Amino acid sequence: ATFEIVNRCSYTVWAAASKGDAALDAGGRQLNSGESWTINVEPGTKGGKIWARTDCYFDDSGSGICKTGDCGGLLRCKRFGRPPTTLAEFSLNQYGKDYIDISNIKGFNVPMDFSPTTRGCRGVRCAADIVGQCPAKLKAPGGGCNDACTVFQTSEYCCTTGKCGPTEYSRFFKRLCPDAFSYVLDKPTTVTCPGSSNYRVTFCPTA
């Protein structure tokens, strides 16, 4: 399948695409403003993620640091990113359908549209100034708006036992992006698409 990753923000991002224990395609790439990067993701992939990283540095080989979303200091992510990271999430060709979501469960760093480029299903978006408003205790120095599990490490925020409810903090993300997951047990805003669909991830969409 095809993912076209478009940086419509006015600042450079470093896009990332991982499943957790391996890269997807090249695993990451600088996208200056306006730059599109199309990747190939192998059908049937379960649990992949696409995110932006901000304020990175990489050297000639590729090793470095980012202030949001860092994946173990690699330009080319083979693992997931340090919060706060707005997340595009997907598992493809499940049993006849792909399922797409955007998640604020690790926080928010960059606004995002995640839309299908082939018919049958509707996209999802979170474009609101979450970082402009973000509650002080959830702010991240380095940029972005952390989730409460990251800041406080409680069973209720982290839904450790499989039981938890919404919170003042989950609800701050759900007031501003009802289509994105706001905590682990949120009512799913998942989208079911035909198996083998293609997609576009657009950062800073409304930019």
From Swiss-Prot:
InterPro entries, per the entry: Osmotin/thaumatin-like_sf (IPR037176), Thaumatin (IPR001938), Thaumatin_CS (IPR017949)
Cellular localisation: Cytoplasmic vesicle
CDD domains from the UniProt entry: TLP-P
Keyword terms, alphabetized: Cytoplasmic vesicle, Disulfide bond, Signal, Taste-modifying protein
Residue pairs linked by disulfide bridges in the UniProt entry: 9-204, 56-66, 71-77, 121-193, 126-177, 134-145, 149-158, 159-164
Highest rank taxon of the organism: Eukaryota
SUPFAM superfamilies associated with the record: Osmotin, thaumatin-like protein
One GO cellular component, as annotated: cytoplasmic vesicle
Function description: Taste-modifying protein; intensely sweet-tasting. It is 100000 times sweeter than sucrose on a molar basis.
Similarity comment: Belongs to the thaumatin family.
Protein name: Thaumatin I
Native source species: Thaumatococcus daniellii (Katemfe)
